Amino acid sequence: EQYLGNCTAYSVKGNKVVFSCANNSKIMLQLCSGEVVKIWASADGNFVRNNESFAVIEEDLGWKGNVTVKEEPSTYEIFTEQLRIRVNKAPFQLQIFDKYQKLLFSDYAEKGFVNDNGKIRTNKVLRNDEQFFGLGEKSGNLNRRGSAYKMWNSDQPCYGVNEDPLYKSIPFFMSSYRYGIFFDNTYKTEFKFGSESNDYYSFEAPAGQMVYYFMFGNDYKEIIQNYIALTGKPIMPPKWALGFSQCRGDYTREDQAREIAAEFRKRKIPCDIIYQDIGWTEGLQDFDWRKNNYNNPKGMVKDLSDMGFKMIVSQDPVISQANQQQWKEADALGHLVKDVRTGKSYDMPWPWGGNCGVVDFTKPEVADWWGSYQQKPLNDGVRGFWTDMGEPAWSNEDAVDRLNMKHHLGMHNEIHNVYGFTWDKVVTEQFYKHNPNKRIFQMTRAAYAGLQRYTFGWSGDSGNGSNVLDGWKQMANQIPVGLSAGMGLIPFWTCDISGYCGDIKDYDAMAELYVRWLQFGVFTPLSRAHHEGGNAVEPWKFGTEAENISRKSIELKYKLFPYLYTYAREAHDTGLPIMRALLLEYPNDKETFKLNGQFLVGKELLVAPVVEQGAVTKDVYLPEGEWIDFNNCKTKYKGEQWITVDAPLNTIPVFVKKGSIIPQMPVMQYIDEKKVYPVTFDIFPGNLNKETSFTFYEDDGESRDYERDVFCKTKITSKASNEEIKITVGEREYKGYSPAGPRNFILKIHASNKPKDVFAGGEKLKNVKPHVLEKNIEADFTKINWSWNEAENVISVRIPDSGKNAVITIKN
Ligand SMILES: OC[C@H]1O[C@H](OC[C@H]2O[C@H](O)[C@H](O)[C@@H](O)[C@@H]2O)[C@H](O)[C@@H](O)[C@@H]1O
Numbered sequence: 001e002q003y004l005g006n007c008t009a010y011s012v013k014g015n016k017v018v019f020s021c022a023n024n025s026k027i028m029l030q031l032c033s034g035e036v037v038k039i040w041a042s043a044d045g046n047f048v049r050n051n052e053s054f055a056v057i058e059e060d061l062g063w064k065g066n067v068t069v070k071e072e073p074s075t076y077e078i079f080t081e082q083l084r085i086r087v088n089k090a091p092f093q094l095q096i097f098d099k100y101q102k103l104l105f106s107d108y109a110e111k112g113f114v115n116d117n118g119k120i121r122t123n124k125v126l127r128n129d130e131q132f133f134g135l136g137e138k139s140g141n142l143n144r145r146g147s148a149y150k151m152w153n154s155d156q157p158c159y160g161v162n163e164d165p166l167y168k169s170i171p172f173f174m175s176s177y178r179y180g181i182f183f184d185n186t187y188k189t190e191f192k193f194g195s196e197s198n199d200y201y202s203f204e205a206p207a208g209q210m211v212y213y214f215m216f217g218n219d220y221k222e223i224i225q226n227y228i229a230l231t232g233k234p235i236m237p238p239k240w241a242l243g244f245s246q247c248r249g250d251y252t253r254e255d256q257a258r259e260i261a262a263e264f265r266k267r268k269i270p271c272d273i274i275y276q277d278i279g280w281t282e283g284l285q286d287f288d289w290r291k292n293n294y295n296n297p298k299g300m301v302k303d304l305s306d307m308g309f310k311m312i313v314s315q316d317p318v319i320s321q322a323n324q325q326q327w328k329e330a331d332a333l334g335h336l337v338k339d340v341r342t343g344k345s346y347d348m349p350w351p352w353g354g355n356c357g358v359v360d361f362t363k364p365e366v367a368d369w370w371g372s373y374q375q376k377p378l379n380d381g382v383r384g385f386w387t388d389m390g391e392p393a394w395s396n397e398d399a400v401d402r403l404n405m406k407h408h409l410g411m412h413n414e415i416h417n418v419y420g421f422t423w424d425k426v427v428t429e430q431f432y433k434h435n436p437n438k439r440i441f442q443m444t445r446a447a448y449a450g451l452q453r454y455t456f457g458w459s460g461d462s463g464n465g466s467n468v469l470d471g472w473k474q475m476a477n478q479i480p481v482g483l484s485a486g487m488g489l490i491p492f493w494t495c496d497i498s499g500y501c502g503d504i505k506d507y508d509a510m511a512e513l514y515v516r517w518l519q520f521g522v523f524t525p526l527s528r529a530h531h532e533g534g535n536a537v538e539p540w541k542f543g544t545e546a547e548n549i550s551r552k553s554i555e556l557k558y559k560l561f562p563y564l565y566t567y568a569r570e571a572h573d574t575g576l577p578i579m580r581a582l583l584l585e586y587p588n589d590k591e592t593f594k595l596n597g598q599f600l601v602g603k604e605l606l607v608a609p610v611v612e613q614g615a616v617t618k619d620v621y622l623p624e625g626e627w628i629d630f631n632n633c634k635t636k637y638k639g640e641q642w643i644t645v646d647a648p649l650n651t652i653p654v655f656v657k658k659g660s661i662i663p664q665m666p667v668m669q670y671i672d673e674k675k676v677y678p679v680t681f682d683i684f685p686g687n688l689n690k691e692t693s694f695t696f697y698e699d700d701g702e703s704r705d706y707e708r709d710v711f712c713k714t715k716i717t718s719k720a721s722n723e724e725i726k727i728t729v730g731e732r733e734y735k736g737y738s739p740a741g742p743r744n745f746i747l748k749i750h751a752s753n754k755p756k757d758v759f760a761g762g763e764k765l766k767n768v769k770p771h772v773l774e775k776n777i778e779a780d781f782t783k784i785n786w787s788w789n790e791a792e793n794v795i796s797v798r799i800p801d802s803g804k805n806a807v808i809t810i811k812n
Helices: 220-231 254-266 297-306 324-333 364-379 400-404 412-434 472-487 507-521 544-559 561-574 590-594 770-774
Strands: 009-013 016-020 026-031 036-042 075-079 083-088 093-098 103-106 113-116 119-125 132-134 148-150 172-175 179-183 190-192 200-205 210-216 273-276 310-315 318-320 356-358 384-387 405-407 441-444 456-458 599-601 605-607 617-622 626-629 636-638 641-646 654-657 661-664 679-683 691-698 711-721 724-729 733-735 744-750 757-760 785-789 794-800 806-811
Touching: 036 220, 093 210, 103 119, 119 210, 132 472, 172 220, 179 200, 179 220, 210 220, 220 561, 254 273, 254 297, 297 310, 310 441, 318 324, 324 356, 324 364, 364 412, 384 412, 400 405, 400 412, 405 412, 412 441, 472 507, 472 599, 507 544, 544 561, 561 661, 561 691, 636 641, 661 691, 661 711, 679 691, 679 711, 724 744, 757 794, 770 785, 770 794, 794 806
Parallel strands: 273 310, 310 384, 384 441, 441 456, 679 744
Antiparallel strands: 009 016, 016 026, 026 036, 036 210, 075 083, 083 093, 093 103, 113 119, 119 200, 132 172, 148 190, 172 179, 179 210, 190 200, 318 356, 599 605, 605 654, 617 641, 626 636, 626 654, 661 679, 691 711, 711 724, 711 733, 724 806, 744 794, 757 806, 785 794
16 A cells, blocks of 8 residues: 655645655645645645536635745644644655644544555544544434444435435534544545544545545534535525425325315414425326326416415436336437446336436436426426435445446446436526526435535435334434534435334324424424325324324424524525534533434524433433523523423423524414514523624525525614613614515513513603503504513513614613
8 A cells, every 4th residue: 555655845836735745646735715725635646536526616715825835854834824734744744733733633644645556545643532523414323433434325215223324425524623524525435433443533435536625613613614615505495495394105196285285274284395206207207297196287286385385396317218208318318327338328227117217417418408307397386306316226335236337427436426416406407597596495315515505405214114113213313313414514404204114004103203203303494294105194193182292393393483594594604504413502512422312403492302202201411501491481490411301292392592582473374374474582681781682584585586695684682781671673684675564573571570661762661461462463563562471471572673773671
């Protein structure tokens, strides 16, 4: 094996420095910014790659001028605002320190880069206290330290708690030394976080180029912000995507879709999306509504739309040989992935429809061809897709025949991990071209780093196939799977609520597991119930008790829409997921590294779902601050402690941090059932003299205008003093969008005693009964008054949403 060995020279060209080492080997450092360093180690010195990065869309992160290299007798030095880079000459060793001279990231001995006949590996020093997170949508515990992980998009139905690889390959991880690494290589990469030794960790590839980005941060937020500078801001879904979604393996016909739509509304179980699974299409993949299953597809879509339902249909990336017309067409055009052994279209087995041709989404001409096909259901009013089986399916590591696939942009060993990525990119690009200035809804199974630009994600075929009732640990592991997905830039994520796998032979017996799964699931942004085949899993299938609990769970998510939607926008701006591992907000608290049974939803809410069978309590870790039971709003706990709370089947443990302001809307059956509505702000005042706030974000919810920063914002602020609370409704920030109106705001201040008075500016407000304050809340926008609820310990102040600054002073 080949190492870099001694560095004999360097050359600078703009923001790039190239170090020449032994036997034509070279290594480049490129300062994308003061915090982000692109590193390219090369065994032969050439700096070429078969394909430029599929993930990176910007290398200019604001570095000004040349890189300055200071040569010393045995080292070179490069300084930035945040980094001190030390390069050993003999042998070459890259060492990155922070500005306090603490070592962050160092080559291990002389083996920082190792080439072994095309196999490329990077070895770094590993410290005893160094922990690791990320690598995208992967199983096991959040903390990756001690384990090894592989990138090969795989199709492993009913997967276990530690199964790896899974469906998506996002080679971005973060260290608790507060740097991220993105390994910009699409081959079957492997990450070994002290699984071989305590002295080093490694990342490697069997072929391709050793290109990776070192991303400094003072916290994890800063690292993630740097990663989206490189790989793109997440697109936001249409606003209605944050409601509840329903699917089934057999959701493939008109009469059923109409019946299901009617059942949700009759039962007052809120729901926005009805999915249709792959049987909807006549053949793979013609996008024609199956004749025996749909009589009037346009009328169906329109009638569901009038009921507030949006439809999302499946697509696979293959053309069945039995679909002779479309197969012959694709094959004649050269649009199918070839077999290197024959020069002809690769003959791919598939689980339905027979052998198929794999569509080559890396061939440029395929994009418009596919776009015209997929547009058909969209012309009927369908609002988007779920892109399934893009691994490609049935192409796990052991299916070595697949390595003979030759795609336009490369061989399968390179392209496998971006097969689904490039497909999903075509789907979104073509949607944009055919449906201008509209947000796509795409939710995908298979993906690569950078997917956030084109698609959302679900975690595929989860749960227990042998016995559905024994899926508790698998359900529980969807928490860190989702949180890790979030850290890999899948902010808009869900899992199959109820799991995918396992026949439901006994609905009474499955009720408890279904309820707990849905309680967790409604805190995923794209909450979707789904199950294999004809295993119905609508929230009324498990008896009245489970139905009532499930309706309440869904209702809570809908009430939280304005809160969740604000965090949807924060995902676009910062890269932060809605579902946040506590470590992202409390990086100084090492206890957070172990938390696989709870998470934050935005910053203000801590959710701790019960994920153990028979459990009627929950152990919850509370980080810094004081924390209030969000279910009753009375019980308060001190932070930095483990507690045990009561958590029977009808309860989801949810906590709100003291200081929080939570925007909520009324219960509706779908997002924008009421196009205008009063907004309530639940205010839990912080400690004496501490100013807290929430910035309520609004936009049109449908167009791409938000990408050009067309929106409005209303900042609500709270500051408690000695026997006085000041609530400020900030002047509306208008950036080209104005909200639904006219409407009222209701400030709901949680407090132990009725106050003496409430003022709006200098004017004293009339105290009124709750019924008066509530009367004509959607009809009269000239009333300013306040009420007191002794039972709930809430001061309610009604105020028209004028868009003007107002200071509300509560006198205790
Ligand atoms: O009609 C074919 C097939 O349709 C459903 O399954 C599609 C299935 O594909 C992957 O496993 C995804 O990960 C799942 O979310 C999809 O539901 C039915 O479940 C099946 O019974 C049927 O044969």
